Amino acid sequence: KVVRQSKFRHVFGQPVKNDQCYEDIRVSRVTWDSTFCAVNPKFLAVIVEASGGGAFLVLPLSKTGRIDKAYPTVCGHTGPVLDIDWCPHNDEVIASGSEDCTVMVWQIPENGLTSPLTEPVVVLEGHTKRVGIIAWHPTARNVLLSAGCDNVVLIWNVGTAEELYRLDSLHPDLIYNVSWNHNGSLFCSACKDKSVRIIDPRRGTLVAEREKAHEGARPMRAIFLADGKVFTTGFSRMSERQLALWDPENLEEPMALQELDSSNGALLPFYDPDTSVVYVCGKGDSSIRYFEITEEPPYIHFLNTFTSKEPQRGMGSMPKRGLEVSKCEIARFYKLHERKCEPIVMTVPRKSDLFQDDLYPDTAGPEAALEAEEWVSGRDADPILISLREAYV
Amino acid sequence: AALVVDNGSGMCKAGFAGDDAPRAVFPSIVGRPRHQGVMVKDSYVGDEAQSKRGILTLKYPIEHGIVTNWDDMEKIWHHTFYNELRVAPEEHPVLLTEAPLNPKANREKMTQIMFETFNTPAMYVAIQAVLSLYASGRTTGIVMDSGDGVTHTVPIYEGYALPHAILRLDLAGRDLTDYLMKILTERGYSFTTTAEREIVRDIKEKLCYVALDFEQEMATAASSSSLEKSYELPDGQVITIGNERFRCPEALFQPSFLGMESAGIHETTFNSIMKCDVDIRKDLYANTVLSGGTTMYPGIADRMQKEITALAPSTMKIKIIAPPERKYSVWIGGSILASLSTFQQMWISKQEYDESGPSIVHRKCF
Amino acid sequence: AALVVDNGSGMCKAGFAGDDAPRAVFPSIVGRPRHQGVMVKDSYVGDEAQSKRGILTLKYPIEHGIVTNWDDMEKIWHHTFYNELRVAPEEHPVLLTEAPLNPKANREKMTQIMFETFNTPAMYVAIQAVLSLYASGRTTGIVMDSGDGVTHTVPIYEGYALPHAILRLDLAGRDLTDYLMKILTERGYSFTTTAEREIVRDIKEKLCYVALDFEQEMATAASSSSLEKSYELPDGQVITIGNERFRCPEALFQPSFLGMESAGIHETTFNSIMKCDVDIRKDLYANTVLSGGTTMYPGIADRMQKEITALAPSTMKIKIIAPPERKYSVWIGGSILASLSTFQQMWISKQEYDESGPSIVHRKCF
Amino acid sequence: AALVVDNGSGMCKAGFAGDDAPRAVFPSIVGRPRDSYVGDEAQSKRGILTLKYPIEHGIVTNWDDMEKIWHHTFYNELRVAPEEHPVLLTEAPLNPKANREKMTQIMFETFNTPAMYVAIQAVLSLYASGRTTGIVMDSGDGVTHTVPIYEGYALPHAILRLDLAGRDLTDYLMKILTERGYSFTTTAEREIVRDIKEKLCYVALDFEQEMATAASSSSLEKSYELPDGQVITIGNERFRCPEALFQPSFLGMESAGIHETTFNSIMKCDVDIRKDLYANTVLSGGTTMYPGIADRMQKEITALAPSTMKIKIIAPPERKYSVWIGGSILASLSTFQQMWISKQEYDESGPSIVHRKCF
């Protein structure tokens, strides 16, 4: 009664040793507010600065220490890369968006790159402006969403290189980000006109919309939670960063509204559906704050804050399949400096050394539930769950 | 309703969060009979030991801020919850206070006793110096906490503590009480037993003061009787003390009176400031906060102001802050902090401790 | 009302076009706490980090004219528009200044940040050396811009700049500040932390000067105490410095004091003139303009006049132009340029940038 | 029979040229009542007097007290008359030229020493290791210096100074010993803590791994006996005290550790000589005598240096007195007799003669 009942009230972050880091990485110098990093249980993808065109560095997780300045990179784009995303159903497939107005899907060899990679598997050209937003479909196989600066949302079929859907007259201004819902049937998006929109891509209709969700003129974000709610980070009229939770059946007032500080830089939320913990990392900030979203008011409970002395240029979150379960790890973040990628370990302090059943429920697996053809027809399904108990050592 | 417990070396203060004064303030002693019973309870704790002290042996479970006996420590806590506060520990959260630079082993025992012996629902351990700053309404200043066992000087700037500049002095009220007993025998009054230590302590709390100039005061007491005062013993005998009134507190500024090598409280305060960064020494000079019962001597603020000014540069403004209620500054600051709405995130649940261990209390604390 | 922002290695000057002095002048630092907070903002920028520097880790986003961290660079700009000028960047055009021979990659980031992060309506980037010539009301001359990170010599003739004759010297006020810290330890004063770097910089800006004859001044310093000055530290301590007053600025003319293989500022200026055509060297000799805060040392103009004269042919007239407001020459020239009616055609609109890209800012600029 | 005096920051090493070890090693302190006690005498009175370090950071700050220490060395420690033997002095790196002339003036006028020579401590350490090019990490009592030397000449622009040495570690060990209930506050107990540090402390190869080992078993516990017969036990404090050398944040210091200080000094040198300094890192000074410090410094610098560079940390077994032993060998050579600054040369050139005869 005195203390709010929770399991993650004492989660603390701990950076790995210097020999487990990745040094000598020329991280990109693009003003675009993206994660600049995508990590899967196999490789680590970092958007790097190229002399000409654009490239991102893909190296195996075991390739720690200093990276050779001549290490082969995925340099196929004629312009600097903006967003990268690993395929959830394929650890060796990564999609990249760039300002050359095209989306390139790559196939990474199992041992990494021995020579620079210039040819992609698919070249998806459907945008007239730079593509800075990339999001794979969580359930449907080979379905990819790309949103460019032309305020259009496109659904691709990676296997067949077809244009499944085109959503052009739904965003009147620049798009900040998009996030699929739990089953991949809807996606929410934050726009520059201070509006949060929930969109069904297959029907091309606007399910919901909140005008002036955040009153600040600074960029905002909008993501979907597992229970179907909308979590947004934004700014106020007094330029004070806030946090908001929205009920899609009632958008009149937010369920919660908490202010954090009055610093600049967009807040990038990283959400863990298994633990219902949202990690908010600000670009240029030196601290990581995590909140727990529950059904008890105020629906947004501050847990703690991991602090450091170096601002971050980017951040990547390792999925549940790549975490060390035996050490009570619930999240691993690859903090990006300007010349280094420092993994950060978020762990739950537990006295017992056995497998923790409550900390690790069934998580989404690397197997797709549906396919692109079936998803188009109107089929909906939840992600296929796997067990992390086999990963315990 | 949260409980605030401030365990000191000699005196224990307890109460409820939101109040302005501790509800239960009793000495931290355990007394055991030293005679044989001839007429048809083996230990007395707190005030009940103070009323029967003529037949008891009084032992302090804390000596110089170090727990010399944890079996007697549980008696003090049991007396606080059930006999003084008259509350159930398993119903109210408890806010505990710890000395600066408290060993982690000592903090673990306090954590383990509260959660396994008393089964408190929530517990938090706070630094005594930090709490003393809350009561004065400041976020910047150096606190000289001089209690019964040990004296600490903790500089805090803008809510940030500097552990490397924390200085410790093994000289407090108990050493002054023992010194007063030693110098009272020079006048012909002999106090030797542990029961007579409490009598001398009452003399010290009532007739002792700090002289602005020790050498000038000694000449006045050697050529006049205006500084002589009378005290009535429990048996009705009247004793008179002269220069012993200001010689006992003078040991704080001249520890050589006790055969000690360390410097006085004024120099310990100055040395702690000098260990800080140069850019923050200006604010620490003007926000020197006195805390603890050993700082309640009349004229100790004036003497500290005079002594530090002679050490600090002439351009620095020395300001000694001595609130009239500084004897309970640690507790009052604890009551204020425990009532803050932003403090509810710092509670440590019993359920969380059972599954995580003492690793979570070392974090979330300082 | 157009905004003129001059981003330097050590100081950031901001203001409104048409004024005579920058309205906002604050150090270009970002400070972060290095201790833990014990009482219930993770970074400080500008003067706020300077007042709390006793507990902060001060880092310069620009080192040797190279932006080492763009995340901290945006903090300086955000602090400029909203906290110092207290204006909306999207309602006023901004005129920016860049170092000579600025890499195109550096210029693109400055253009990209202004148009996408602050959404300024119009923007233009000007050469700092050219602007310093505008403040002096000249179209011909060589500007020796010596700021906090780097020193540049840019000869300009009849409005035409000569990029091939531009020389760069990696030696400026920050290197002099670090050298002063090194030579102050020889006198027994230890300044090591970044917070004490700013203290030594304040010493350098107040007590340092350039000697006309370095060896003669050394003899006077070793036989007299007339050149000794006293400085008051923030904590009230007074330090005395002797020959260090002119030894630190002597590194400008003798880089070998820092172990550098390059030549002094006098030879860098002379070598830059010799790289120009012979028919224009006469005008550059008589129009040497000093700029930047590192040229504010007393007697630097006379020493520079003496050194170049010994190098130049006897028939040439050497004239060193050192206006007493040369510390803000770059900003003052920017305000003058932004107010000229002929400059309104040089603005680059935000609408033009998104449809054309950084190709239009590489053109229309030099 | 020349005299070799190594003027350390906290300990003065004195002896005779040709001997393998210094005869006298006593603290370099001057004590005055809270009327003048120097060396062990100032420590024997304990708390009645206050202690002052004249060479606290390798650089002499109180020449009046420094003369007292030298008078104590010649007459009370070495038990010889300084006017009958040549004296070889040693100086810390980055010593101002005014200090060099003052030492020459004192030796020839106050002690009337017939012959005098001044040598750099860092240079003598490298020579005793059989090298002319390398970087010497001189970690003494009150100061730590990383002196890169090329062809026998120290590079002044690349010499880095760290005010973190054995004196700060001893105070840190006193602070962390109180967490076990022990109380060492007086000057007498400080010499006991220094004795504990020199016998039972060691540098752990992996600090975080070592903390887990110390908290899961009692294999790292060691027992030490106090002078009064009491026996104390120390666990993880054995490797926590010397860890402050590599993590100065343990003492609240912003400065970098000795591994980063060594690397930073190397990067301040010419690019074409950095490969030689990486392979010729020679440890020297008393604070470098912790077991396992060579392996730890090898591991830490390799993490900083490029992977293609070869890192070799040289830890001679005699490195504690390598400065003095180097001085004794050099001063005992018959061919060295011509490089002494004779008193006759002093009368002609004055104290300025030391700049051209000893560089």
Ligand SMILES: Nc1ncnc2c1ncn2[C@@H]1O[C@H](COP(=O)(O)OP(=O)(O)O)[C@@H](O)[C@H]1O
């Ligand atoms: N008015 C007073 N004058 C002098 N000494 C006092 C006075 N009141 C209390 N003391 C001394 O203060 C000591 C402890 O007070 P306190 O600060 O409560 O210590 P603790 O922190 O150990 O509880 C007692 O031993 C007592 O001698």
Ligand SMILES: Nc1ncnc2c1ncn2[C@@H]1O[C@H](COP(=O)(O)OP(=O)(O)O)[C@@H](O)[C@H]1O
């Ligand atoms: N009066 C002065 N005397 C000597 N140096 C000065 C003086 N004023 C400023 N400086 C130095 O000038 C440097 C930066 O001045 P400025 O020209 O504004 O540099 P920037 O071009 O980087 O803004 C500072 O580091 C400071 O040390």
Ligand SMILES: Nc1ncnc2c1ncn2[C@@H]1O[C@H](COP(=O)(O)OP(=O)(O)O)[C@@H](O)[C@H]1O
């Ligand atoms: N065996 C040892 N292990 C660790 N530290 C030592 C050892 N012997 C001496 N020291 C430390 O070395 C310090 C002084 O050694 P030294 O290098 O002679 O100093 P200096 O050169 O400044 O006189 C002492 O403070 C002592 O703590």
Ligand SMILES: [Mg+2]
């Ligand atoms: Mg107390």
Ligand SMILES: [Mg+2]
């Ligand atoms: Mg400038």
Ligand SMILES: [Mg+2]
């Ligand atoms: Mg030495």
